[PDB]
Design a protein around this ligand. Sequence first.
Ligand SMILES: C=CC[N+](C)(C)c1ccc(CCC(=O)CCc2ccc([N+](C)(C)CC=C)cc2)cc1
Ligand SMILES: C=CC[N+](C)(C)c1ccc(CCC(=O)CCc2ccc([N+](C)(C)CC=C)cc2)cc1
Lengths: 540, 540
Amino acid sequence: EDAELLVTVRGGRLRGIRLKTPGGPVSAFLGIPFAEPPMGPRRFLPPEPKQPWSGVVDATTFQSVCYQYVDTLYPGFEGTEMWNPNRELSEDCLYLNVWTPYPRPTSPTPVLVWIYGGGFYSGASSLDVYDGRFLVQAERTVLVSMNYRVGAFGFLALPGSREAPGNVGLLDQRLALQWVQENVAAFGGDPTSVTLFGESAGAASVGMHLLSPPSRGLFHRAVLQSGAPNGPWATVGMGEARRRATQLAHLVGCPPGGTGGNDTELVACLRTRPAQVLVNHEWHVLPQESVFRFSFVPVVDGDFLSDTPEALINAGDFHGLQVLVGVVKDEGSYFLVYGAPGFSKDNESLISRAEFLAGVRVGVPQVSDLAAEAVVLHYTDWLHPEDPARLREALSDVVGDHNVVCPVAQLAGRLAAQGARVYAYVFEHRASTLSWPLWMGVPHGYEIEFIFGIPLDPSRNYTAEEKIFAQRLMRYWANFARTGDPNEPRDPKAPQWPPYTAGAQQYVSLDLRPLEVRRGLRAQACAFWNRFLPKLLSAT
Amino acid sequence: EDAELLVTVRGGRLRGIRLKTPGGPVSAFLGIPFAEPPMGPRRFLPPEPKQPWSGVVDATTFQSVCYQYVDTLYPGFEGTEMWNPNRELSEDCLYLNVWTPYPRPTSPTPVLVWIYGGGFYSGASSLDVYDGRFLVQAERTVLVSMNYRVGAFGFLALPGSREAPGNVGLLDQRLALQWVQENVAAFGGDPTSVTLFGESAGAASVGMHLLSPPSRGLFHRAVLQSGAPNGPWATVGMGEARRRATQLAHLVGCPPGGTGGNDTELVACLRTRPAQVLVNHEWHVLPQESVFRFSFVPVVDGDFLSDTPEALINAGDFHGLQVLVGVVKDEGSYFLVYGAPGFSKDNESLISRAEFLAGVRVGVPQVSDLAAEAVVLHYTDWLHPEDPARLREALSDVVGDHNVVCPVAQLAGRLAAQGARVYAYVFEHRASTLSWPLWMGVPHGYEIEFIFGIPLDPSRNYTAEEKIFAQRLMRYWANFARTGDPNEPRDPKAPQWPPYTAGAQQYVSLDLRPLEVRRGLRAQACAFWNRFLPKLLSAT
Ligand SMILES: C=CC[N+](C)(C)c1ccc(CCC(=O)CCc2ccc([N+](C)(C)CC=C)cc2)cc1
Ligand SMILES: C=CC[N+](C)(C)c1ccc(CCC(=O)CCc2ccc([N+](C)(C)CC=C)cc2)cc1
């Protein structure tokens, strides 16, 4: 018996599986329960730690995906199906995975913890693009990844109530962080060197753990890829969260007329519905037509978040913290085919001026007409106010800057100014195997496959340069996880990655070429969103 | 005796004078009266034509400069005193000048009519920089220039009342245009080919005549240099004009204590005051501290202008009209030493961030703080928001765009779209003899000396290339006067000057290097001034 694949934790024993890589094996422990199944009366409730078990839990395959909406916009299309659940759906989904090098480290080893994105309504740790075998083999860190409840099961909130407090999906992540503290040593991992990293809604989750004291003591570095907690999509107010929860209850027959509708009876009725019935109405509760807006997201209750993320970032002391942040080149192009008029993944999407003006109200919903006019002023090329190709890039910039690029830059500058050491990047390589149309450029989410070393998979058709490029990125991420600085420790030959400051605002472009330093994360555009537009909305 | 210096016109006989140029003599008739002296009871009234005289009026020297404020900011300085009056001040100032080639043309010759600027409060046709001997000698055109009343004597208005109708200085200009119609043939000039050209407030004046039906039938082409009638400084409302005229009257003791307030006594009391007393209180009636704002300007009365210039430009059909418009590279730098904090012509004017924010309220007076916030957003480089040099040029752009470059580009686009053939230029040569500091670049008003061929004066220190350059511009301006087209018209190797259209927005740069087409007269900045900022003021 290979004792490598046999490990004991505080709950009991596990058997793992050995994974092959072109350069050696890794030990994987997939599907470890870290919480009691949040079913029945535990729906919408904070997680309870998994009770200890007799025997040996089989940890050889990924467990079930949490109940979530399944994208059907393009059936059979790799670009969308690669994010859909690849396991059976179940509310019994609170399991985590641990990768560790072979042979198991006799040293303590820094631990990377992955939090998947998906707009807080979708995502799973079992997706092939989150496969940690290549990262662990190449850089010999310990990689953990958890499943957390999404959609209504994770973020439905009747604020101020005990039956559905909200943010329980964030607590699921926190519970897996505490599990890493108490058990990662048994896998050769150093619980004093824990680096969180996530993408999209995962990056917002990482940022919200930076701003939550109870979670703050469970990690020491943080990486936020194409996401931030301060953005306009990542949180929601109590009153609007209550309206959406009530809207979902009404759509599924809760409460049954004409019985009372206080918070206890409302959640009690919600707990009797099959989980799929709730999923089938999740998008019906969004107030207006939009892109980059989701129904059940973290709520600002005063509990998990003392105040708004924006407030906590401003009043926050971040000394002793090192953060890696960044975005992709075209953060907004992916979302345009999900509601922007005139857009289609199967043509050039050379939109008209009327479609551009119509899309601005969908990409920037919930704003006054004067605010929309300011957006149109800032993003119109007035020497070419109706060139379709430029209108397409402009709306992509509108959605991208408003939702990702500027909230990130807002966070990056406020962190470096208030004590934190910050590194910033912009991912500019478009995968040679990318299936989305070329007018999308480098879309949201398509740096992940290079961070996780997927090109090293011999069954895939990446090029030789992309494999070398994937090794550079895993080195950057591992160097940062080990030292807090992505630069190679004793290497002066390598082009160096300067920190990001509030004044210089230096970042690097990541692609096949060597590192290239630039300054300003779209400084002129983000000044409009971060500085002027709030003044335009308050003076109304 | 040379008989070509003796010419008879409708009012009587004249003796002129012969002026020398390096390439041949020119016949000049300086000081022809075209109106009765607007003195005594005729102060503030429209001009009356000059009654016929017996004998020979001497026309060998310039007549008196109209009463006006005299700049004292920098005594002894060539940069300011080149614009100050060079003849005695008098209300008896309605005289015009005619230059004509030697020998006098035998066939009708195109006429250029100059209208000096000076914020409607200053200026004279006798200034050395307006000497027409070189333009008339080099291009054998006929040049006329007139004096018109400035300040209160030309533009004090009690709207509605008959004793201070307002715009009498524009009627002075109109009367000089009727004189050119009735008499320029006696000098060899073609009254069917007359081209107006003015600078600053003269360019605005030229625009007002384009929009005035009684004046429109007196010319066929227009050149507007660094000015337009639609700008924020060239016109004033009726209610504001009444308040400025009433405050001036109070500042000089009108009316006497306890006597009535009706408009006849007000003007009657104003007519008893010495002209210098009215001049000494001119800058005291303005509302706020500001640059590029003047007390007595054309009033929108319903008479000379049936509506505002901005409205008349939109509604008018300009088919059959050719327009030459343009600007200098640094339109706003001159005005900063006249009120912007931290500025001085004798240092580098490296202002601070606080001084930039203060200067914006002086450069854009009486706008909302929200409007000023948008101004600062647009002209701050947020990667270098406090570099003193960038703040200096940014404030120069603020004053230049708001007052000159964007009203001109707006007029140029509307003229071309609505039937007129338009040519646009940017003057980018800084005179080698310029006495203003180097940080001012190419200031307001310093293309005039090259248009008028001043470098050809042997008693100056211009370089050889500047003389060649001045001949190119005189050829440009003269070709446009003859043909309505600044091109040769045939070389065709000479680099051509394409018309300005509302779409392509093509203009050329005028300097020592050959002509060069560019696109967009500050397209992005003028979209903020022309398109966005109005909607911001409407929402308040
Ligand atoms: C690609 C990124 C990968 N990761 C990071 C996981 C990722 C990040 C972010 C997202 C959200 C994408 C959307 O905002 C579509 C939202 C949307 C979906 C469906 C609908 N219907 C209306 C139901 C369909 C009709 C059109 C409307 C809106 C997905 C995946
Ligand atoms: C240079 C161009 C030549 N031309 C075209 C004739 C020309 C065009 C435009 C102007 C206006 C210049 C000003 O706006 C000074 C305005 C000003 C003057 C005096 C004052 N005090 C308060 C009295 C002095 C204190 C500062 C304030 C403001 C001048 C000349």
